[PDB]
């Protein structure tokens, strides 16, 4: 086991970083270190632990040493290991100072959110319409083209932000950072640097319970979705109108106040809202600054998209054989899959006849 | 009285354990003694299989009698060893327990995932095992593409029986999934055709699952709780690599299933733990009210029309065994000209034949037609 102790100029140790083979050895070493320095364990809160170099010394941990130097702490190594579980802890008052005093110390790392439309293959007349998302405002998208918004935002959005890993409010731990929806980039003690969050909520696939403080263990809670989308995008697919009203009112207020186990908690709100819908009239009484419409594909665009996907040049007549419902992006993907299957099974015949056969199959054989 | 067979590495580390014994208590005591003797902690092993095995065809349990096991371990870089020989004379059922080390389980999960891929067979269709009119086989041949299908079934054909009759092949599926000490069962002893066992996977015939609105419950599409930390996977997870057929389902369920297939995985929360499992199956919707699913896209649509006069006569000749006159087509109710109607007519005709002896079969057919119509003159 190897322990790194970051102390101030007066010798007061405030940062502990223990490395050990397993969890039991790690906790035993941590308790031995706490007792050996007459440090009450109640003064240190664990912020990170888990699994993940010939030797691990001070010269191996250059980035940690630099970050501690930014915080005015010195990095030392008690021993050397020859080649794994690790635990990180900081003192309580240092945590408070990070919360209030040293808040924007690592602001210089946060990049700027940018939209790069060269990473997707889309027509120009739709890129022009979708460029309005750069303003970072609440948007309602009339999606008659059945485009996949979350995939597009995953593809084109670039940048980084910093979010708190968790909130400790009077011995209650509310978890903000989750390893499933957030793309990890780095961890700066109390905060985590990640890519701008993109959260998706589908009415048929998800539950409304996600919008409440869900209990996991005693004194452990998971924050609602709109708190886990801080600094990013929250996309709702066909949501109820009441939920939209509640979210708009919460954004207008600027904070959420809740009661849990007799303790009152207030948390600020900062995110962007996107409503991806095909029935806009359901939200007639609500006001969104940005409205985007995606029309059905016309004949020229349909032919261009088919040529792009299938890899062949379809003729004009095949425009009039497909049903009107299939002239969207999802219909194009289904046509591509069916055409690929037909070409794989039926070898020797030309591709245009395969396209005609696929169109005949799709329409049910009349 | 008992025997233990060990799959061992070259460096002496123990990785695979199998125990044969007479009963459960003897098996577990032998397993615990074996673990304790070689300084092994029970947590490092996970119980993969346990149950009764037939040893009627085996005179004794030796290393030479388990050459398939030896080959399987050799393909994984392990050697099979035994501590002795167990005599199985006069014994048919023997309790067997099979367990592997945790690191081996993880290696099979991630690194050695596709080692046994060569065992599987490609899925093919053999339409010579059923007798149907050719104009219907031509329409039904489109099921070989294995795309999502909607069947407008006005001929009242039994799709699950046809698919169970005309489908050949093999597929490997996991027996269960272990996630944060939770266990989710995938292999189903009632709906799956057992074909072989390969450590943590089971080779079976391509699963075919049927769900009927008026017979089954929607709870089949949720993680059912058997006991603590044990769950049964939903239907679409037990149809991996096969077919899921839905008879008159509600539109919301179809929409949810299509969205789940589009997303590619199912993620949920159980007992404060988050799980995510991939999805891979083929959906068939058998219905007589297609307009209920107008807003959804299905790449393949198959329409089965009611039998006409010539086809009805041909099917009657095929099933009954006699050649009826043409006038027969003008006495039966219009809605009876399907396959189910033909089956009912066949059963009634057989019972009338049994009751009345010596009568000509045409008169028996006319009498059955009169009985069906309620005796209206």
Contact B185, B232 (CB under 8 A): yes
Q: In A, which residues are within 8 Å of B253 by CB distance?
A: none
Instruction: Transcribe A110-150 into DSSP letters.
Output: ----EE-GGGS---HHHHHHHGGGGG---EEEEESS---HH
Resolution for this model in angstroms, one decimal place? 2.8
Distance CA B253, CA B278 (A): 18
The gap from C-alpha B367 to its chain's centroid, in whole angstroms, comes to 42
Distance CA A219, CA A265 (A): 13
> Would you tell me the crossing angle of helices A299-310 and A329-345 to the nearest 10 degrees?
40
SS3 string, A29-67, reads HHHHHHHHCCCCHHHEEEEEEEECCCCCCCCCCHHHHHH
Distance CA A28, CA B77 (A): 38
Contact with chain B for residue A260, Cβ under 8 A? no
Q: In A, which residues are within 8 Å of B274 by CB distance?
A: 180
Q: In B, which residues are within 8 Å of A330 by CB distance?
A: 297
CB–CB contact B297 A330 (8 Å): yes
The three-class DSSP label of residue B355 is: helix
Nearest CB among A205, A325, A338 relative to B299 is that of A338
> How far is the alpha carbon of A362 from chain B, nearest alpha carbon, in Å?
5
CB–CB contact B252 A204 (8 Å): yes
Distance CA A66, CA A74 (A): 9
Find the residue in A nearest to B144 (Cα): A345
Q: Give the DSSP H or E segment for B97.
A: strand B93-101
Distance CA A286, CA A244 (A): 9
Contact with chain A for residue B270, Cβ under 8 A? no
Take residue A220 and report the two structure tokens written for it: 């452990």
Residue whose pair of structure tokens reads 């997870």 in the numeric block = B237
> How far is the alpha carbon of B62 from chain A, nearest alpha carbon, in Å?
40
Specify the pairing of strand A184-188 against strand A191-194: antiparallel
Q: Euclidean distance between the first and final Cα of chain B, in Å?
A: 77
CB–CB contact B297 A337 (8 Å): no
Take residue A141 and report the two structure tokens written for it: 């998208």
Nearest CB among A204, A334, A338 relative to B255 is that of A204
The gap from C-alpha B85 to its chain's centroid, in whole angstroms, comes to 37
The three-class DSSP label of residue B301 is: strand
Beta-strand ranges (E) seen in chain A are: 2-7, 13-20, 44-51, 85-91, 114-115, 139-143, 157-158, 161-164, 166-169, 172-175, 184-188, 191-194, 198-202, 214-217, 220-222, 233-237, 255-260, 263-268, 272-277, 290-294
Instruction: Transcribe B246-295 into DSSP letters.
Output: EES--HHHHHHHHHHHHH-EEEEEETTEEEEEE---EEEEEES-GGGGTT
CB–CB contact B145 A342 (8 Å): yes
Contact A291, A140 (CB under 8 A): yes
Q: Under 8 Å CB-to-CB from B238, ≥6 apart: which residues?
A: B186, B188, B191, B192, B207, B209
Q: Under 8 Å CB-to-CB from B71, ≥6 apart: which residues?
A: none
- Mutate which: A218, A326, A361, A363, vs B, most B CBs within 10 A: A361
Take residue B259 and report the two structure tokens written for it: 């969205």
Specify the pairing of strand B273-278 against strand B208-212: unpaired
Determination technique used:
cryo-EM
Distance CA B260, CA B263 (A): 5
Distance CA A98, CA B225 (A): 45
The three-class DSSP label of residue A251 is: helix
Distance CA A192, CA B126 (A): 58
Q: Is B156 left (phi over 0), alpha (psi -120 to 50) or beta?
A: left
Residues in A 332-351 with any Cβ partner in B closer than 8 A: 334, 337-338, 341-342, 345
Q: In B, which residues are within 8 Å of A338 by CB distance?
A: 145, 147, 299-300
> How far is the alpha carbon of B274 from chain A, nearest alpha carbon, in Å?
9
Residue B241: name the closest of B280, B197, B208 by CA. Answer: B280
Q: Give the DSSP H or E segment for B49.
A: strand B45-54
Instruction: Residue B147: count other Cβ atoms within 10 Å of its Cβ.
Output: 18
Specify the pairing of strand B243-247 against strand B282-287: parallel
Distance CA B88, CA B59 (A): 5
Distance CA B152, CA A33 (A): 73
Distance CA B171, CA B117 (A): 9
Interior angle at CA B235, CA B229 and CA B239, nearest 5: 115
- Maximal C-alpha separation, chain A: 86
Interior angle at CA A161, CA A182 and CA A200, nearest 5: 40
What are the CA-CA distances from residue A165 to residues A158, A191, A281, B9, B35 (Å)? 21, 5, 39, 43, 43
Alpha helices, H only, A196-262: 225-228, 241-253
Backbone angles phi and psi of B178, in degrees to 5 = -110, 110
> Would you tell me the crossing angle of helices B339-355 and B309-320 to the nearest 10 degrees?
40
Contact with chain A for residue B300, Cβ under 8 A? yes
Take residue B258 and report the two structure tokens written for it: 């299509």
CB–CB contact A205 B272 (8 Å): no
Contact with chain A for residue B135, Cβ under 8 A? no
Burial B214-236, CB ≥16 within 10 A → b, else e? eeeeeeebebeeeeeeebbbbbb
Nearest CB among B255, B269, B297 relative to A334 is that of B297
Nearest CB among A202, A216, A362 relative to B259 is that of A202
Contact with chain B for residue A361, Cβ under 8 A? yes
Sort A10 into a burial class: Cβ within 10 Å, 0-12 / 13-18 / 19+.
Answer: exposed
SS3 string, B5-28, reads EEEECCCCCEEEEEEEECCHHHHH
Nearest CB among B147, B259, B274 relative to A341 is that of B147
Contact with chain A for residue B154, Cβ under 8 A? no
Contact with chain A for residue B370, Cβ under 8 A? no
């Amino acid at each position: 086991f190897v322990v790194m102790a970051g102390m101030r100029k007066d010798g007061t140790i405030d940062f502990i970083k223990v490395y050990a083979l397993n969890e039991k050895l790690a906790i035993e070493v941590l308790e031995a270190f706490l007792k050996e320095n007459n440090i009450h364990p109640s003064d240190f809160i664990v912020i990170q632990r888990g699994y993940e170099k010939k030797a691990i010394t001070t010269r191996s941990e250059e980035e940690l040493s630099a970050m501690l130097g930014r915080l005015g702490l010195r990095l030392v190594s008690n021993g050397v290991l020859y080649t794994l579980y690790q635990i990180t802890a900081i003192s309580r008052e240092l945590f408070e100072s990070l919360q209030k005093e040293k808040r924007e110390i690592f602001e210089d790392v946060q990049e700027k959110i940018t939209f790069n439309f060269s990473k997707v293959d889309l027509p120009e007349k739709y890129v022009k319409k979708l460029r309005l998302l750069e303003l970072m405002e609440d948007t309602i998208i009339f999606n008659m083209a059945e485009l996949e918004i979350p995939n597009l935002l995953k593809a084109i959005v670039e940048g980084t932000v910093l979010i708190p890993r968790f909130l400790e409010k009077e011995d209650l731990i509310i978890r903000i950072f989750d390893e499933e929806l957030h793309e990890y980039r780095g961890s700066y003690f109390d905060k985590v640097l990640i890519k701008p969050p993109i959260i998706h909520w589908d009415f048929y696939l998800d539950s409304l319970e996600d919008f409440s403080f869900k209990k996991v263990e005693e004194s452990i809670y998971i924050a609602p979705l709109f708190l886990r989308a801080t600094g990013g995008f929250l996309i709702l697919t066909e949501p109820p109108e009441d939920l939209v009203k509640t979210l708009l009112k919460l954004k207008k207020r600027g904070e959420v106040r809740t009661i849990l186990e007799g303790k009152r908690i207030t948390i600020p709100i900062n995110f962007t809202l996107i409503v991806d819908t095909r029935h806009p009239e359901r939200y007639a009484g609500l006001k969104f600054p940005i409205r985007i419409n995606l029309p059905p594909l016309d004949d020229e665009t349909f032919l261009k998209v088919l040529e792009t996907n299938l890899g062949i040049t379809p003729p004009t007549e095949i425009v009039r054989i497909f049903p009107p419902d299939y002239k969207t992006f999802l219909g194009v993907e289904l046509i591509k899959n069916l055409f690929e299957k037909l070409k794989l099974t039926e070898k020797g015949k030309d591709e245009v006849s395969l396209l005609k056969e696929a169109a005949t199959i799709i329409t049910g054989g009349t």
